[PDB]
Design a protein around this ligand. Structure first.
Ligand code: PLP
Ligand code: PLP
Ligand code: CL
Ligand code: CL
Ligand code: MG
Ligand code: MG
Ligand code: MG
Lengths: 386, 386
């Protein structure tokens, strides 16, 4: 059984991750590759072990937010292609080439200056580059056909750079009204056919996120980018309710009860602000998780955890490192009992989606804000490690 | 200047931290020591460098959330007392004793069992213990004077344990109604008096947090626990309004613009959900911070950042790693320009307190949820380092 000083931990089930990959693989066209998106520390699941498992069970490339995230994976021994999705400063062009990291760019000047850096160097390898086409997300990427062609010509003329992909991003593919998504797809195809008409051969084309891979598998082209779905979470209720792919949540968040007491004596005030007053016979359990772990303070007097298969409420405010929950007047319970904060216990469940609804946010945020001070354990073939 | 691949960072001004410690030292009784509270990675500031600086400029001891947090500080070469404020499992008693980490406890059985473990392992070090008295926070601690007396006796009969402190925590010391705080104080003093009448000599007594230290310096006893104030942030508007001590905020959060564009062509939708539509001559700047950094998704179409001394609004939804802001029609801004996300720029300021207000939370949560993937730089004697 796990031995911790501070008894709060994450369990990431890699069997579930395998099934999720397999479910998406079985759904999109046979020829289409999967790029596993493991940015923000694997959406809080741990980038390294999730990347490793994915590359073994259906994924061939990885995506991250930064060169630094890519370097973490390289240091763990991962050799698969790694794409940086955001902007990389020219000060890191040399480093990205040394570490065989693929960068996103979309500007003539960036291609030319990056090529110039490498030229000046004893550079025995070309830096791989994907071009980002902005078809409506309005975040990064080139937005016109004429500028796309100039960027492609600059990249091709840059002998120390190598074009290995071209992509766009869907901003509303998880929504019931598909009008903007169809316009984005049409625009992306039109830019690509424009390049082909110039005599240009296209590298790897990718455009789908989890939502579009599920709702528009016909858009999978050479490769999709599997994010939220890898972790067994749906990009929106609408996509989940389409019932096209069965995903299993990989993450659970657990703790052990640190102390249990009956509130016999006065004051029966609980936690900061004394916003909660216990009954004389009420049992309060203290748990070693708080808002610095990523357990939102807005769950003060609102959240629930699972203990012995039942939902028990957060009592009073969430503090930085601890919460208190009521086991009721008696609330049978002992120091050391296991509680589930996110996940399943007996027949009961508090899903990350339910937590996100309560907080008016999305499951993406709930998992990707889990602090690195919570240790992560991994389940593979029904056994636990790491 | 700073060179990053992903151009987002934190600056922690240790000159301000020094000035904050000095203002509390000058306010509380000369004889009272200061325990600097550096759990949760130094309230997201970085525990090591804040602890080192505090100990050079007035603090005598440190507090953390867990043994693991205390061990990080020992490994940094720190020799000062380190108290674990929360519950430590008996599985870590051996380890805590070896690293000279002080644990809080408050139950007879825990004391007796911890002593037995250390006996059985022929521990070359005694374990330092503080006793937590729960006088109304309802989180951890012993709640009756009779119970307290049995805990003390058990600790004292435990030759492998060493009593070095006794404390309580105020749940409402930062509020205008002082009734609860005065009742806690009175109860604490009554419990301590009970022990003395038994002839017990008291170790180091501490009860004040930042709030009580400012509003009730006469309760400073042998030592206070300086947390939020160390970082130049007040525990509540009310305490700040008392105007008794001058604190300077130590943390700022900055980025450089990753890309700038005029939204000449359609569609002019920005970010997920297409919740924002730009004008044809409107300038949109993209920044490498997002909600997995701890920049709340609830700032979507609401937050502000500083660019060239002026507030510019978040446009559309916050994404996992990036945000977009509007520089307005024909607005001036270039890739590489520095933006301040939390802090000051030219005449302007977006304080952590103002962000916390926007989000209906408190400054403690805003700073302590800043992801460790943001690098921290430190300013000391006016110059940067890491
Ligand atoms: C984060 C991200 C993804 C993965 O998206 P999911 O919605 O999680 O599947 C794909 N593409 C881009 C450009 C991203 O930023
Ligand atoms: C975190 C903490 C402190 C520091 O409190 P501030 O409000 O930040 O000054 C003091 N005491 C205890 C018991 C704590 O957990
Ligand atoms: Cl993008
Ligand atoms: Cl407490
Ligand atoms: Mg973190
Ligand atoms: Mg004075
Ligand atoms: Mg948060």
């Amino acid at each position: 059984m796990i031995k911790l000083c501070r008894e709060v931990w994450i369990e990431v089930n890699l069997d579930a991750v395998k099934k999720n990959l397999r479910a998406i693989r079985r759904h999109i066209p046979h020829k289409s590759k999967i790029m596993a998106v493991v940015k923000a520390n694997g959406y809080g699941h741990g980038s390294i072990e999730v990347a490793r498992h994915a590359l073994e069970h259906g994924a061939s490339e990885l995506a991250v937010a930064s060169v630094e995230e890519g370097i973490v994976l390289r240091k763990a021994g991962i050799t698969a292609p790694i794409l940086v999705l955001g902007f990389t400063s020219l000060s890191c062009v040399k480093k990205s080439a040394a570490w065989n990291i693929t960068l996103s760019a979309f500007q003539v000047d960036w291609m030319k200056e990056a090529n110039e850096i490498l030229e000046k160097e004893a550079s025995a390898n070309r830096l791989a580059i994907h071009i980002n086409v902005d078809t409506g997300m309005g975040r990064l990427g080139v937005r016109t056909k004429e500028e796309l062609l100039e960027v492609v010509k600059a990249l091709k003329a840059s002998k120390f750079l190598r074009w290995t992909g071209i992509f766009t991003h869907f901003s509303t593919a998880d929504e019931p009204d598909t009008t903007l998504t169809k316009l984005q797809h049409e625009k992306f195809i039109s830019f690509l056919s424009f390049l082909k008409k110039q005599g240009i051969e296209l590298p790897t084309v990718h455009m789908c996120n989890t939502a579009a891979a599920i709702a528009f598998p016909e858009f999978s082209a050479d490769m999709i980018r599997l994010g939220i779905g890898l972790y067994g979470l749906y990009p929106s209720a609408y996509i989940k309710q389409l019932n096209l792919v069965k995903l299993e949540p990989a993450l659970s968040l657990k703790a052990r009860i640190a102390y249990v007491k009956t509130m016999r004596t006065e004051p029966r005030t609980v936690s900061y602000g004394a916003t909660y007053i216990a009954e004389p016979n009420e049992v309060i359990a203290t748990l070693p998780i708080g808002y610095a772990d990523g357990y939102s303070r807005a769950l003060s007097n609102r959240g629930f955890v699972l203990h012995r298969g039942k939902r028990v409420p957060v009592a009073g405010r969430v503090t930085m490192d601890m919460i208190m929950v009521s086991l009721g007047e008696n609330g049978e319970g002992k120091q050391g009992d296991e509680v589930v904060i996110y996940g399943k216990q007996k027949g009961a469940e508090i899903s990350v989606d339910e937590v996100a609804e309560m907080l008016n946010t999305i499951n993406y945020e709930v998992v990707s804000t889990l602090s690195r001070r919570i240790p992560r354990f991994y389940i593979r073939d029904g056994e636990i490690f790491k």
